[PDB]
C-alpha cells in the first residue's frame, strides 16, 4: 500500500510525463536498451538497431514508447486499484512476448532514471521513493498474474 501522499507525488510527476509523452518514451526505452541490450532482442523490427540516432528517428519505436506510457499511467492513476488494468496486459507479456520480471526490473529502472534526469526538482527522494514503491506494486501484481496464467516470472 501507499499512502494517499505517496500516490499524490507519483501523479505529479506523471503529469509532467504527460506533457511529452512521446519524449519521455523514447527517453526511457533508449536508456532500457543501453543498460540492457537484450531487452531489445524482444521487438523484430528494430533488433538490427545499432545507434541512438537511429533508435530516435525510429517511427516504431516512438509508437511503443507512448503505447507502454499509456498503459503505466492509466496504472497508475488507480493508484493500486489496478487488477482490471494488469489482466490483459500480464495475458499478452506473459504468454506472447514472455517478458520475464527482470525485465520488467529494467524498465522500471530506466523510468526512475529518465523521470530523475529531467524532473530533478519534482523527484527528490521523497518522490522517487513514492513511483519506486508503485512500480514494485506493479511488478509484484503483474508477476502472481503470471504465474496465474502458467508463466514462471
Ligand atoms: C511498464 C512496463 C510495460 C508496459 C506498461 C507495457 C505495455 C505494453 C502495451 C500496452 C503493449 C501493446 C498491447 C499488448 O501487446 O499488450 C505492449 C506491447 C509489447 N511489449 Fe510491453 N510493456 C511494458 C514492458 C515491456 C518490456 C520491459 C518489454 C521487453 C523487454 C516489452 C515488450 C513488448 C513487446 C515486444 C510488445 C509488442 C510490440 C509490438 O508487437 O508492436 N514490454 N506493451
Not at 36 to 54: M, V, Y
Not at 60 to 66: M, N, Q, S, T, W
Not at 80 to 92: M, N, R, T, V
Request: proline content about 3%; aromatic content about 6%.
Amino acid at each position: 500500500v501507499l499512502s494517499e501522499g505517496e500516490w499524490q507525488l507519483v501523479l505529479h510527476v506523471w503529469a509532467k510525463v504527460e506533457a511529452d509523452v512521446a519524449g519521455h518514451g523514447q527517453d526511457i526505452l533508449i536508456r532500457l536498451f543501453k543498460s540492457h541490450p537484450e531487452t531489445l532482442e524482444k521487438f523484430d523490427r528494430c533488433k538490427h538497431c545499432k545507434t541512438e540516432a537511429e533508435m530516435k528517428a525510429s517511427e516504431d519505436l516512438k509508437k511503443h514508447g507512448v503505447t507502454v506510457l499509456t498503459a503505466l499511467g492509466a496504472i497508475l492513476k488507480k493508484k493500486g486499484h489496478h487488477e482490471a488494468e494488469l489482466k490483459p496486459l500480464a495475458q499478452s507479456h506473459a504468454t506472447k512476448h514472455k517478458i520475464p520480471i527482470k525485465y520488467l526490473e529494467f524498465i522500471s529502472e530506466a523510468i526512475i532514471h529518465v523521470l530523475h534526469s529531467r524532473h530533478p526538482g519534482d523527484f527528490g527522494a521523497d518522490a522517487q521513493g513514492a513511483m519506486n514503491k508503485a512500480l514494485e506494486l506493479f511488478r509484484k501484481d503483474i508477476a502472481a498474474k503470471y504465474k496465474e496464467l502458467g508463466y514462471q516470472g
